[PDB]
Amino acid sequence: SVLQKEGIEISEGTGYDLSKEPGAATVKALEQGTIVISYKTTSENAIQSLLSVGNGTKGNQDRHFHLYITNAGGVGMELRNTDGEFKYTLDCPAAVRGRVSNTVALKADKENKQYKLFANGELIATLDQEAFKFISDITGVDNVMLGGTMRQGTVAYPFGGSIERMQVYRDVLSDDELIAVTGK
Amino acid sequence: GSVLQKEGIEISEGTGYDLSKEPGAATVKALEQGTIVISYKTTSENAIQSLLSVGNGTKGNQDRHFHLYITNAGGVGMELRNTDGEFKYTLDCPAAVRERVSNTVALKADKENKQYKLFANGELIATLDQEAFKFISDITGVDNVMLGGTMRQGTVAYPFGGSIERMQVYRDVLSDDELIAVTG
């Protein structure tokens, strides 16, 4: 992993800044890679970012990436650099249990121009875009955080609970590894 | 054969064009899968312009609809929604289309293969695979079909302006080669 955290408890609304951590610079420029997160939510917020990487400055609220969960057992991601540039999304319903640990992962595979989302030992969605993008295509990325997404200096999409384990890889893990690692 | 077809329809921005009473509309309102092919010319700067929508126009049901849309930045996309707790499937492709010019786009929703594919001007531009495949028949309380907008609580949302030159809806799932040919 280029960045890893474990056992991080987050109060709803606060987030947990990773922007100064060794490895954060690498995460802020990812051209592809893999993100694996085990978590337990205690929040009823409708959209809860587990990990985000983006531009937190004024007027750049549509320039970010996040991997998120919902209050209805959903898992998704959005990858955005304003709608005119790109708004790539995956949103999967009823993928996890709607006080229970879950493990999710996102793979972004530049060679295949594919994004794959996994939850609890299952591939739940795949996206192929003619114009592949990732974090390095977002303009002005300046922050990495757990448990929310910075939008004009405000913590948006606020998570509450535990980030049990978070790992970010520059490498693109195989579908078998991700089935295995997102299992029990 | 198409189950619903219209040609040479002008629409001023905000007006829409109701198809709800047309023979074939009932079939469109219950599609479990199918194919939509549309040639159009937009004259509107609206950011999101529905070419064709099928949904629930009643109050409180503004997140229960399907539409195939274009943007003011050369984008093409679709959203398929039955409130966020149930499903919100979005495929949004930037810079897919380009004196104003005519463009031809298509969406294929393939139940057997649990896939959605979007085409523009002779090219496959995106593919979405979802473990929980959904289509129009999964939306609750569908009561209308229209060109040039989406009914949300009795208001024309996502308003298109310009010409719907040719619009066809099929219950059949056309081949990728057919769609490359008909859109190009």
Numbering used by the authors:
A (entry chain B): 8 to 105, 111 to 196
B (entry chain A): 7 to 104, 110 to 195
Authors' account:
Ruminococcus gnavus is a human gut symbiont wherein the ability to degrade mucins is mediated by an intramolecular trans-sialidase (RgNanH). RgNanH comprises a GH33 catalytic domain and a sialic acid-binding carbohydrate-binding module (CBM40). RgCBM40 displays the canonical CBM40 β-sandwich fold and broad specificity towards sialoglycans with millimolar binding affinity towards α2,3- or α2,6-sialyllactose. RgCBM40 binds to mucus produced by goblet cells and to purified mucins, providing direct evidence for a CBM40 as a novel bacterial mucus adhesin.
RgCBM40 crystallised as a dimer, adopting the canonical CBM40 β-sandwich fold with six antiparallel strands on the convex face and five on the concave face (for data collection and refinement statistics). Electron density was observed for all RgCBM40 residues present in the construct (50–237). The sialic acid binding site is on the concave face at the dimer interface, however, size exclusion chromatography with multi angle light scattering (SEC-MALS) indicated that the full-length protein, RgNanH, is monomeric in solution. The SEC-MALS predicted molecular weight was 73 kDa, indicating that RgNanH is monomeric in solution. The macromolecular architecture of RgCBM40 is conserved among members of the CBM40 family, with the exception of Vibrio cholerae CBM40_NanH (VcCBM40_NanH) which is proposed to be part of a separate CBM40 subfamily. No significant conformational changes were observed in the binding site upon ligand binding.
